[PDB]
Scaffold this active site. Structure first.
Site, PDB file in Angstrom:
ATOM      1  N   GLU A  35      -3.075  19.842  -3.030  1.00  0.00           N
ATOM      2  CA  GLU A  35      -3.847  20.900  -2.831  1.00  0.00           C
ATOM      3  C   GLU A  35      -4.579  21.644  -4.110  1.00  0.00           C
ATOM      4  OE1 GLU A  35      -4.583  21.871   0.118  1.00  0.00           O
ATOM      5  OE2 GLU A  35      -2.989  20.893   1.421  1.00  0.00           O
ATOM      6  N   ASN A  46     -14.183  26.913   3.237  1.00  0.00           N
ATOM      7  CA  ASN A  46     -14.155  25.621   4.294  1.00  0.00           C
ATOM      8  C   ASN A  46     -15.606  26.127   5.225  1.00  0.00           C
ATOM      9  OD1 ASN A  46     -10.806  26.809   4.347  1.00  0.00           O
ATOM     10  ND2 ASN A  46     -11.449  24.873   3.527  1.00  0.00           N
ATOM     11  N   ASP A  48     -15.878  26.681   8.395  1.00  0.00           N
ATOM     12  CA  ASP A  48     -15.631  27.941   9.000  1.00  0.00           C
ATOM     13  C   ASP A  48     -15.891  29.125   8.449  1.00  0.00           C
ATOM     14  OD1 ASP A  48     -13.228  28.193   7.936  1.00  0.00           O
ATOM     15  OD2 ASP A  48     -11.808  28.392   9.705  1.00  0.00           O
ATOM     16  N   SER A  50     -13.866  30.454   6.114  1.00  0.00           N
ATOM     17  CA  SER A  50     -12.473  30.889   5.608  1.00  0.00           C
ATOM     18  C   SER A  50     -12.364  30.169   4.310  1.00  0.00           C
ATOM     19  CB  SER A  50     -11.437  30.478   6.618  1.00  0.00           C
ATOM     20  OG  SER A  50     -11.440  28.990   6.327  1.00  0.00           O
ATOM     21  N   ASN A  59      -4.873  29.439   3.502  1.00  0.00           N
ATOM     22  CA  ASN A  59      -6.131  29.765   4.188  1.00  0.00           C
ATOM     23  C   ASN A  59      -6.312  31.416   4.619  1.00  0.00           C
ATOM     24  OD1 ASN A  59      -8.017  29.708   7.035  1.00  0.00           O
ATOM     25  ND2 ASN A  59      -8.481  28.320   5.285  1.00  0.00           N
TER      26      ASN A  59
END
Ligand SMILES: O=C(O)c1c(Br)c(Br)c(C(=O)O)c(Br)c1Br
Length: 129
Positions: A35, A46, A48, A50, A59
């Site tokens: 990660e 991201n 979207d 976020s 997130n």
């Protein structure tokens, strides 16, 4: 902070992640490796809108507040910046809530795609635990 592999394992163990929800310590170290590459300051935006924060890339749509993810929740009740500290307490406490949410560690895409089903114990081998 960029943790060493065994250094992170020891910190995760002290904070109670070893075997949490049945996930051995190697699963958590492997997840952090893929990660964030063990970097507490890692952030990734991201599509979207976020953003993922910290050593476990948590997130902002569901788990923390960053003030710029409209219509999002803050289920860990923390600013997302708290997930970037050299002290991993906030990331661990939030990860415990995430992994209890129903899908287990499948919430972490890097874990599902790069750790799940592999020899995760290798991530703690050679460490003084
Ligand atoms: O289980 C919780 O509700 C929780 C969470 Br989630 C986080 Br994050 C923290 C923190 O380290 O800020 C704490 Br304290 C607690 Br209690």
């Amino acid at each position: 902070k960029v943790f060493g592999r065994c250094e992170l394992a020891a910190a995760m163990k002290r904070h109670g992640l070893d075997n949490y929800r049945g996930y051995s310590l190697g699963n958590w170290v492997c997840a952090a490796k893929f990660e964030s590459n063990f970097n507490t300051q890692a952030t990734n935006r991201n599509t979207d809108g976020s953003t993922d924060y910290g050593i476990l890339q948590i997130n902002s749509r569901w788990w923390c507040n960053d003030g710029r993810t409209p219509g999002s929740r803050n289920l860990c009740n923390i600013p997302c910046s708290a997930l970037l500290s050299s002290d991993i307490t906030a990331s661990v406490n939030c990860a415990k809530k995430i992994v209890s949410d129903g899908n287990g560690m499948n919430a972490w895409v890097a874990w599902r795609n790069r750790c799940k089903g592999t020899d995760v114990q290798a991530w703690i081998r050679g460490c003084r635990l």
